[PDB]
Design a protein around this nucleic acid. Sequence first.
RNA 1: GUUAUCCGGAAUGAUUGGGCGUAAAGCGUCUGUAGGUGGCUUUUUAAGUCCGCCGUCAAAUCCCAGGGCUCAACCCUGGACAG
Lengths: 199, 171, 134, 25, 227
Amino acid sequence: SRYRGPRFKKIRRLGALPGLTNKRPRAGSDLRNQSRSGKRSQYRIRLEEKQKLRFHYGITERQLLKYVRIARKAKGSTGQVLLQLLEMRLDNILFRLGMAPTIPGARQLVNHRHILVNGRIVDIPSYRCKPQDTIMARDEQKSIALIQNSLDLSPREELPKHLTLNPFPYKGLVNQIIDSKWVGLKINELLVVEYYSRQ
Amino acid sequence: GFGSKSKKEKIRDGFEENVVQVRRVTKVVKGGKHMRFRAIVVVGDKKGQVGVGVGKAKEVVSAVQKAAVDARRNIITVPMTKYLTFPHRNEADYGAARVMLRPAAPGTGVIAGGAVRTVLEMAGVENALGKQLGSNNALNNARATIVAVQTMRQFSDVARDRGIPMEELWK
Amino acid sequence: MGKDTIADIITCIRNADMNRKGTVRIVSTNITENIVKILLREGFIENARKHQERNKYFLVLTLRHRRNKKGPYLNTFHLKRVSRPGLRIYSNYQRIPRILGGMGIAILSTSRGIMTDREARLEGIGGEILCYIW
Amino acid sequence: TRERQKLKQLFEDAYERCRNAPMEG
Amino acid sequence: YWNINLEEMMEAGVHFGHGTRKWNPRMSPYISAKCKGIHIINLTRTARFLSEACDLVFDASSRGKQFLIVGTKNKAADSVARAAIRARCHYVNKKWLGGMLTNWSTTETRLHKFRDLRMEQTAGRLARLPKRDAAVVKRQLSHLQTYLGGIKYMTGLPDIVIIVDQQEEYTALRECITLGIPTICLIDTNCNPDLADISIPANDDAIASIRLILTKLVFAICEGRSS
RNA sequence: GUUAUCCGGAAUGAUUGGGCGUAAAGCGUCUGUAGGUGGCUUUUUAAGUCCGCCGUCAAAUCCCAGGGCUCAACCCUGGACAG
């Protein structure tokens, strides 16, 4: 699905989901009740690291089991490799290049078939990019400057070291797989990895 | 009787505390049947420094902190050589709780049962896996891990003990 | 002189130092001589001496210690048999285990002689694992 | 600080109770 | 340097050990001989461990600390006090309480009351109250006089505690092992070298052997203060 | 979501991995057949054991690496440890 839903709920519960669904911080007129008082079971903590990951990328949870099985299946730090297989997801890159303000914005911006990759169109948000790729607009998007609106309001945050945004010819490419320091979201890999040990 | 114990509580950035169980244990008397609280507190910084402690008192919070003062005089340091994991596998029973600890790859958060996982997530190790063989208990379990990580040796002190100069180690 | 001549020496080692006594008297057969030869040179023990009592050549073996402690030897020795009589174990040069990463050794019976993991891993030969200590 | 000083003392003594049970006499 | 000639101990009651069928056999690689129902302690390792003893006493006072000595036996009762008034150390008079080292908070408050009662005993207001209050103050002041009269000059824990031989004070010794406080003590022919971590195995049947090792360590401490 | 079937958890059939004084459990004790295990030294064959090489264990599956379907599922090409 998309979850397509009320989302300041998820920001108040999970903590501030960075970039995804807002640059606006939560509870501009809210939070004036509901003392937590400090009781939270540890399973709630690991569950909130699931959904801190799952809402921040908009994944289906069954697909997140799929990415964990591939992450175990690869060789190396599974806590990091999970955040390589979920960074080189395409609409995360179009978010990170500022081609859309939010990640539902990027997912819808790639559903309606506005992205060529290496000159070929990719209609699917779960496309996993590679090193040395090419990410452009559509030919109609020099007449449909929605991407240029997003690139107009974007450039507070610059880019991490895989990206290379070309200003008017609108091309962004990733030099190499993103480093852990490079990952934008702040979370503990071990907490999430431990949670899926049960399966 | 100076008041409010502000300087005297020692704000506990140095040791973070958690309970692992608070069972109400009760004794009967001539008058009836009255209970006290036995709490088990595992103290420890994430540097590699933990220890258990039991306590019991008629209040909950005095039993927790009383178990903490019993706990913060009972500390071992964790032999944890590599990138926050274990030198070698180990097993050590205490009473009737046996605990198998096993070192892990760095892409593995700590996976163990609740008492073992509690004393390891307070021990600052990140990469272990410890099955528990035996009891459903929590105290003898955790204390069995503490005995199961005292008796654990690095490569530098085994190289020092045997006298062999150095090889057979990747790092 | 029971069933095993290797649980002879080995159980005399465990029973020796679990009572902290730093002195072993055992028989000196060929394989005991070979084990203490590949065991004094690996830093576990101190000295092995042959002598005779009624013209029966024995090994007295001095264990390691440290200084005046709660127990004068810190690292407990932890000797263990593997290939029991009646259940023989055999390994290739693949299965041959690095005990605790290498902090223990697995003395085993090659066609060469009896080696350790160092001296049977470089050879590429394999054979019957007598016992591993750690 | 006092606890640390105590620990240091205990180490000193254990080493002083480490140097000469070996050798000596 | 801190030497003792082998003949000064070998003449006196040092190898004059204890009973030949009471030996606790962790001295089996230690004890030299046995004669006439009395053990014979090896004097070489005795004097070497005393060399080590005075090295580790004089070094520890060379850092600058305060030492403690336990006196309880009533065979070596006043000899410790003679070995503690000149040596500046605080000492046990006759008898020990279980808790004077580990439970020292209540012992500290008990020294608040003992200090206040000595302040009232000196001030001359003792003869104000009749025989009831004077009787009670003399009784509790007598009991604290039995224990806390010899350690008024201590706050906190010492570094090295030297104890009456082994038998009567396993209590104080085990409080020292719980606190971790290193102790260097005397061993009989039938006791543990592994209770403390260095000790001095010599029989204490002789008063002059007790005066020997204690006098030796008294000059060790006083020369530790000599700075 | 419920149910059913199977494995896990279960070291709750235990080689890895349990027990038998009192918790379930040592035959009432003993002789001994079959069978099982067995002292030390030296020598011989190599059945076990180990090492090399060779043959085979179809293809498909699983594992690795590439490639194709807009990705994945799936399909395809090559390779191989085990054993």
